[PDB]
Design a protein around this motif. Structure first.
Motif, PDB file in Angstrom:
ATOM      1  N   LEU A  87       0.818  -1.207   0.000  1.00 35.93           N
ATOM      2  CA  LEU A  87       0.000   0.000   0.000  1.00 35.93           C
ATOM      3  C   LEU A  87       0.858   1.266   0.000  1.00 35.93           C
ATOM      4  CD1 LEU A  87      -2.748  -1.210   2.419  1.00 35.93           C
ATOM      5  CD2 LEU A  87      -2.977  -0.872  -0.020  1.00 35.93           C
ATOM      6  N   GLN A  88       1.946   1.310   0.777  1.00 32.91           N
ATOM      7  CA  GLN A  88       2.796   2.508   0.763  1.00 32.91           C
ATOM      8  C   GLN A  88       3.394   2.741  -0.623  1.00 32.91           C
ATOM      9  OE1 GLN A  88       5.762   2.839   3.923  1.00 32.91           O
ATOM     10  NE2 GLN A  88       6.467   4.767   3.033  1.00 32.91           N
ATOM     11  N   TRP A  89       3.841   1.647  -1.264  1.00 29.12           N
ATOM     12  CA  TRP A  89       4.406   1.713  -2.616  1.00 29.12           C
ATOM     13  C   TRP A  89       3.364   2.182  -3.644  1.00 29.12           C
ATOM     14  CZ3 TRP A  89       3.399  -2.274  -6.611  1.00 29.12           C
ATOM     15  CH2 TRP A  89       4.218  -2.140  -7.755  1.00 29.12           C
ATOM     16  N   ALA A  90       2.166   1.567  -3.630  1.00 28.24           N
ATOM     17  CA  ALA A  90       1.157   1.871  -4.645  1.00 28.24           C
ATOM     18  C   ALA A  90       0.631   3.311  -4.504  1.00 28.24           C
ATOM     19  CB  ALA A  90       0.000   0.887  -4.455  1.00 28.24           C
ATOM     20  N   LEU A  91       0.584   3.806  -3.258  1.00 24.40           N
ATOM     21  CA  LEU A  91      -0.131   5.059  -3.040  1.00 24.40           C
ATOM     22  C   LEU A  91       0.797   6.263  -2.910  1.00 24.40           C
ATOM     23  CD1 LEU A  91      -3.135   3.861  -0.960  1.00 24.40           C
ATOM     24  CD2 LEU A  91      -2.903   4.154  -3.437  1.00 24.40           C
ATOM     25  N   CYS A  92       2.131   6.052  -2.812  1.00 21.62           N
ATOM     26  CA  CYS A  92       2.981   7.244  -2.591  1.00 21.62           C
ATOM     27  C   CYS A  92       4.075   7.303  -3.656  1.00 21.62           C
ATOM     28  CB  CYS A  92       3.600   7.237  -1.191  1.00 21.62           C
ATOM     29  SG  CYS A  92       2.352   7.201   0.127  1.00 21.62           S
ATOM     30  N   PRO A  93       3.736   7.275  -4.951  1.00 22.14           N
ATOM     31  CA  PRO A  93       4.746   7.452  -5.990  1.00 22.14           C
ATOM     32  C   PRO A  93       5.203   8.905  -6.036  1.00 22.14           C
ATOM     33  CG  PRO A  93       2.512   7.565  -6.957  1.00 22.14           C
ATOM     34  CD  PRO A  93       2.361   7.097  -5.524  1.00 22.14           C
ATOM     35  N   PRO A  94       6.175   9.230  -6.895  1.00 27.72           N
ATOM     36  CA  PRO A  94       6.685  10.594  -6.990  1.00 27.72           C
ATOM     37  C   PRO A  94       5.590  11.609  -7.239  1.00 27.72           C
ATOM     38  CG  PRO A  94       8.209   9.097  -8.076  1.00 27.72           C
ATOM     39  CD  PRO A  94       6.989   8.262  -7.692  1.00 27.72           C
ATOM     40  N   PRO A  98      -1.112  13.877  -0.968  1.00 30.78           N
ATOM     41  CA  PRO A  98      -1.701  13.221   0.197  1.00 30.78           C
ATOM     42  C   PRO A  98      -3.210  13.426   0.304  1.00 30.78           C
ATOM     43  CG  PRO A  98       0.386  14.260   0.775  1.00 30.78           C
ATOM     44  CD  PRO A  98       0.079  14.691  -0.647  1.00 30.78           C
ATOM     45  N   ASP A  99      -3.735  14.592  -0.120  1.00 30.27           N
ATOM     46  CA  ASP A  99      -5.163  14.852  -0.002  1.00 30.27           C
ATOM     47  C   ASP A  99      -6.015  13.915  -0.871  1.00 30.27           C
ATOM     48  OD1 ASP A  99      -6.870  16.838   1.374  1.00 30.27           O
ATOM     49  OD2 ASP A  99      -7.487  17.395  -0.662  1.00 30.27           O
ATOM     50  N   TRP A 100      -5.389  13.226  -1.847  1.00 33.94           N
ATOM     51  CA  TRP A 100      -6.139  12.281  -2.686  1.00 33.94           C
ATOM     52  C   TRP A 100      -6.375  10.926  -2.019  1.00 33.94           C
ATOM     53  CZ3 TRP A 100      -4.027  12.723  -8.419  1.00 33.94           C
ATOM     54  CH2 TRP A 100      -4.241  14.029  -8.877  1.00 33.94           C
ATOM     55  N   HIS A 101      -5.894  10.763  -0.791  1.00 29.90           N
ATOM     56  CA  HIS A 101      -6.181   9.534  -0.033  1.00 29.90           C
ATOM     57  C   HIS A 101      -7.293   9.865   0.961  1.00 29.90           C
ATOM     58  CE1 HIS A 101      -1.609   8.634  -0.773  1.00 29.90           C
ATOM     59  NE2 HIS A 101      -2.323   8.463  -1.877  1.00 29.90           N
ATOM     60  N   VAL A 102      -8.476   9.265   0.762  1.00 33.15           N
ATOM     61  CA  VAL A 102      -9.705   9.758   1.415  1.00 33.15           C
ATOM     62  C   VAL A 102     -10.312   8.623   2.240  1.00 33.15           C
ATOM     63  CG1 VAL A 102     -11.918  10.931   1.058  1.00 33.15           C
ATOM     64  CG2 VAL A 102     -10.047  11.254  -0.609  1.00 33.15           C
ATOM     65  N   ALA A 103     -10.552   8.845   3.532  1.00 33.96           N
ATOM     66  CA  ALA A 103     -11.225   7.849   4.372  1.00 33.96           C
ATOM     67  C   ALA A 103     -12.448   8.445   5.059  1.00 33.96           C
ATOM     68  CB  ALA A 103     -10.265   7.249   5.399  1.00 33.96           C
ATOM     69  N   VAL A 104     -13.327   7.559   5.519  1.00 35.10           N
ATOM     70  CA  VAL A 104     -14.441   7.942   6.393  1.00 35.10           C
ATOM     71  C   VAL A 104     -14.277   7.195   7.705  1.00 35.10           C
ATOM     72  CG1 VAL A 104     -16.964   7.778   6.752  1.00 35.10           C
ATOM     73  CG2 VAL A 104     -16.033   8.338   4.483  1.00 35.10           C
ATOM     74  N   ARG A 105     -14.445   7.921   8.836  1.00 36.39           N
ATOM     75  CA  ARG A 105     -14.412   7.260  10.138  1.00 36.39           C
ATOM     76  C   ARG A 105     -15.704   7.584  10.869  1.00 36.39           C
ATOM     77  NH1 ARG A 105      -8.696   9.206  12.819  1.00 36.39           N
ATOM     78  NH2 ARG A 105      -9.808  11.200  12.966  1.00 36.39           N
ATOM     79  N   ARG A 106     -16.120   6.696  11.771  1.00 41.45           N
ATOM     80  CA  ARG A 106     -17.244   7.037  12.630  1.00 41.45           C
ATOM     81  C   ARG A 106     -16.739   7.986  13.712  1.00 41.45           C
ATOM     82  NH1 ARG A 106     -19.891   2.089  14.472  1.00 41.45           N
ATOM     83  NH2 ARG A 106     -18.440   1.856  16.229  1.00 41.45           N
ATOM     84  N   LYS A 107     -17.406   9.149  13.895  1.00 44.90           N
ATOM     85  CA  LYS A 107     -16.859  10.254  14.685  1.00 44.90           C
ATOM     86  C   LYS A 107     -16.692   9.904  16.168  1.00 44.90           C
ATOM     87  CE  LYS A 107     -17.409  14.473  14.548  1.00 44.90           C
ATOM     88  NZ  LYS A 107     -18.126  15.703  14.955  1.00 44.90           N
ATOM     89  N   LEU A 113     -14.396   3.204   8.342  1.00 49.39           N
ATOM     90  CA  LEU A 113     -15.572   2.677   7.653  1.00 49.39           C
ATOM     91  C   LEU A 113     -15.388   2.576   6.138  1.00 49.39           C
ATOM     92  CD1 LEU A 113     -18.415   4.720   9.426  1.00 49.39           C
ATOM     93  CD2 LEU A 113     -17.497   2.454  10.012  1.00 49.39           C
ATOM     94  N   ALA A 114     -14.503   3.381   5.527  1.00 51.53           N
ATOM     95  CA  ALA A 114     -14.445   3.415   4.055  1.00 51.53           C
ATOM     96  C   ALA A 114     -13.131   4.064   3.617  1.00 51.53           C
ATOM     97  CB  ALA A 114     -15.623   4.196   3.459  1.00 51.53           C
ATOM     98  N   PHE A 115     -12.707   3.823   2.359  1.00 52.97           N
ATOM     99  CA  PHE A 115     -11.474   4.360   1.837  1.00 52.97           C
ATOM    100  C   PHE A 115     -11.582   4.480   0.320  1.00 52.97           C
ATOM    101  CE2 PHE A 115      -6.929   3.660   0.385  1.00 52.97           C
ATOM    102  CZ  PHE A 115      -6.384   4.812   0.947  1.00 52.97           C
ATOM    103  N   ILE A 116     -10.857   5.449  -0.261  1.00 54.65           N
ATOM    104  CA  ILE A 116     -10.679   5.469  -1.727  1.00 54.65           C
ATOM    105  C   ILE A 116      -9.364   6.197  -1.929  1.00 54.65           C
ATOM    106  CG2 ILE A 116     -11.926   7.677  -2.132  1.00 54.65           C
ATOM    107  CD1 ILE A 116     -12.914   6.541  -4.795  1.00 54.65           C
ATOM    108  N   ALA A 117      -8.621   5.874  -2.973  1.00 55.62           N
ATOM    109  CA  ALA A 117      -7.324   6.533  -3.142  1.00 55.62           C
ATOM    110  C   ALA A 117      -7.064   6.932  -4.587  1.00 55.62           C
ATOM    111  CB  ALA A 117      -6.179   5.671  -2.668  1.00 55.62           C
ATOM    112  N   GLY A 118      -6.571   8.157  -4.778  1.00 54.99           N
ATOM    113  CA  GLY A 118      -6.076   8.558  -6.091  1.00 54.99           C
ATOM    114  C   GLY A 118      -4.567   8.789  -6.077  1.00 54.99           C
ATOM    115  N   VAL A 119      -3.906   8.522  -7.224  1.00 54.99           N
ATOM    116  CA  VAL A 119      -2.481   8.828  -7.379  1.00 54.99           C
ATOM    117  C   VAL A 119      -2.324   9.499  -8.745  1.00 54.99           C
ATOM    118  CG1 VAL A 119      -1.479   7.011  -5.863  1.00 54.99           C
ATOM    119  CG2 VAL A 119      -1.854   6.570  -8.345  1.00 54.99           C
ATOM    120  N   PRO A 120      -1.320  10.375  -8.935  1.00 51.99           N
ATOM    121  CA  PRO A 120      -1.105  10.999 -10.246  1.00 51.99           C
ATOM    122  C   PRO A 120      -0.551   9.973 -11.239  1.00 51.99           C
ATOM    123  CG  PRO A 120       0.640  11.631  -8.678  1.00 51.99           C
ATOM    124  CD  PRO A 120      -0.407  10.876  -7.877  1.00 51.99           C
TER     125      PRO A 120
END
Ligand SMILES: CCCCCCCCCCCCCC(=O)SCCNC(=O)CCNC(=O)[C@H](O)C(C)(C)COP(=O)(O)OP(=O)(O)OC[C@H]1O[C@@H](n2cnc3c(N)ncnc32)[C@H](O)[C@@H]1OP(=O)(O)O
Ligand SMILES: CN(C)CCCN(C)c1nc(N(C)CCC#N)c2sc(C(C)(C)C)cc2n1
Ligand SMILES: CN(C)CCCN(C)c1nc(N(C)CCC#N)c2sc(C(C)(C)C)cc2n1
Ligand SMILES: [Mg+2]
Length: 411
Positions: A87-94, A98-107, A113-120
């Motif tokens: 996961l660190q390799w796939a999500l943190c390329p050059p 960081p703002d493109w890694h998005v989670a939901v937590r119960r407050k 509860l949920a996750f989605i990730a974007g990378v350039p």
């Protein structure tokens, strides 16, 4: 039929997809100023969270969500178990954002509860070759060439909702928040893949698998002993023989990739990927990141004879939890990544992939029929599997292409 997807800038049907003759945007051109900084609304008992995917403990929290809730088969036999290092390799390329890694937590209590990730990714996504020919025939070459330049876009992966929250329309809210965060950085297209059929893929390829440890695969019911082997006194012995491999690579000069190989590997890879309609453009920093070996994650070998690197291959590791069984807890799969051959036929290069993967304790080698993957299927005893990878764009009209015209590997 699609209460969410009908509202989004994507082609809505196959019929529509058939009318597409040029690459280009679906939606109104907009600016960052048109996008609000206030996060997308979410119910009062939840909150958005941005994990730091370079920090061990936040990677671990996302790792556990995916281990327990990510993609599984329909009979609940296997569930993917992407590792923390992966996961660190796939999500943190050059130049990742960081703002493109998005989670939901119960407050209340911070349950994830949920996750989605974007990378350039920098992608060639201009009109494909067979449609540029049609354009030339109609006198429409200008319009067909408008978006030939590689584009800096977003690749989306790892969308996951906790099993207890399924079918509550949380995935659409995740997707709209991710889209807002990407749009705030002046990026307007994305590329994504899924097994499921959504509106509307621009390409689709079947998965293929190559048995490396057939006795284990039969034991865990990933494989069965095929009917034809029942004609033998010892079906399993004959199945093991069928899939047997050398215990050491056959290509002279094969060795692991090292940093000094980056320029030559970039050269031969980019020359090769240029032949396909849709494919990434990688800098030296990106070649380093995605191809230099990383223990337990990505494995890359070059053929070097007489001081020159002429070929290379890479594969990455995705284990699965074996949910039902008693001899085994994990299925260890190697997936074919990028490669390029200039000195030897592709089948000869990829045989050494299977030999190294088997040597290292992988149970199966998998791939999608993208790139020239179809060229070594039969000789190397891959078979087609019951699964497909469909390729989609967000906010990009694109003519249908064959999977052998796709050069983007998705993890
Ligand atoms: C410019 C920047 C743009 C950035 C964004 C680009 C778009 C990125 C898009 C995401 C690319 C992800 C790439 C990958 O990661 S593909 C891997 C997806 N992950 C899994 O399969 C893991 C296991 N499953 C789950 O976690 C949940 O079942 C998920 C989260 C998938 C859906 O949660 P749930 O089952 O609780 O449903 P809901 O009630 O919340 O939502 C229902 C709506 O969701 C639509 N749905 C179901 N599956 C997918 C899917 N794989 N891609 C897109 N949409 C999907 C579905 O058609 C329906 O819409 P509509 O049919 O009513 O219209
Ligand atoms: C709408 N669906 C479910 C298409 C199903 C495609 N998916 C997610 C999927 N996934 C699978 N895995 C997760 C296997 C590797 C792991 N994990 C498997 S393993 C499998 C057999 C080899 C047992 C037949 C089918 C299958 N299918
Ligand atoms: C976002 N991404 C690119 C999700 C790659 C997941 N992976 C690793 C994946 N996926 C599969 N799918 C059918 C796509 C499920 C999804 N999404 C399959 S089907 C398969 C065989 C067992 C048939 C060989 C291996 C396999 N592997
Ligand atoms: Mg939901």
């Amino acid at each position: 039929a699609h209460a969410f997807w009908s509202t989004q800038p994507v082609p809505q049907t196959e019929d529509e997809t058939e009318k597409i003759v040029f690459a280009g945007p679906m939606d109104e051109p907009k600016t960052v100023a048109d996008i609000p900084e206030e996060p997308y609304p979410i119910a009062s008992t939840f909150e958005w969270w941005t994990p730091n995917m370079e920090a061990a403990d936040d990677i671990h929290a996302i790792y556990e969500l995916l281990r327990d809730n990510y993609v599984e088969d329909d009979d609940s036999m296997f569930r993917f178990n992407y590792s923390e290092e992966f996961l660190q390799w796939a999500l943190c390329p050059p130049n990742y954002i960081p703002d493109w890694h998005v989670a939901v937590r119960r407050k209340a209590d911070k349950k994830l509860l949920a996750f989605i990730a974007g990378v350039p990714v920098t992608l060639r996504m201009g009109t494909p070759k067979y449609m540029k020919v049609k354009a030339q025939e109609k006198g429409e070459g200008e319009e067909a060439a408008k978006y030939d330049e590689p584009r800096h876009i977003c690749e989306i992966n790892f969308l996951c909702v906790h099993k207890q929250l399924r079918e509550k329309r949380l995935a659409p809210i995740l997707i709209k928040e991710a889209t807002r965060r990407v749009n705030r950085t002046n990026v307007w297209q994305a590329v994504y893949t899924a097994g499921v059929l959504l509106p509307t893929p621009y390409a689709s390829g079947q998965y293929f698998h190559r048995s490396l440890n057939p006795e284990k695969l039969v034991e865990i019911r990933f494989s069965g002993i095929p009917a034809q082997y029942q004609k033998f006194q010892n079906p399993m012995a004959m199945l093991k023989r069928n899939y047997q491999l050398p215990s050491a690579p056959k290509n002279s000069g094969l060795r692991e990739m090292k940093p000094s190989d980056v320029p030559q590997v970039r050269r031969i890879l980019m020359n090769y990927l240029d032949s396909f309609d849709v494919g990434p453009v990688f800098s030296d920093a990106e070649i380093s990141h995605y191809l230099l070996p990383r223990d337990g994650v990505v494995f890359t070998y070059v053929v070097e004879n007489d001081k020159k690197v002429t070929d290379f291959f890479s594969f990455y590791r995705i284990p699965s939890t074996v949910i039902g069984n008693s001899n085994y807890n994990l299925l260890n799969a190697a997936y074919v990544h990028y490669y390029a051959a200039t000195s030897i036929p592709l089948h000869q290069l990829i045989l050494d992939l299977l030999i190294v993967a088997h040597s290292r304790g992988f149970d199966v080698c998998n791939m999608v029929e993208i790139l020239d993957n179809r060229s070594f299927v039969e000789q190397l005893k891959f078979g087609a599997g019951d699964g497909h990878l469909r390729y989609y764009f967000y906010n990009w009209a694109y003519p249908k292409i064959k999977p052998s015209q796709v050069a983007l590997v998705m993890l």
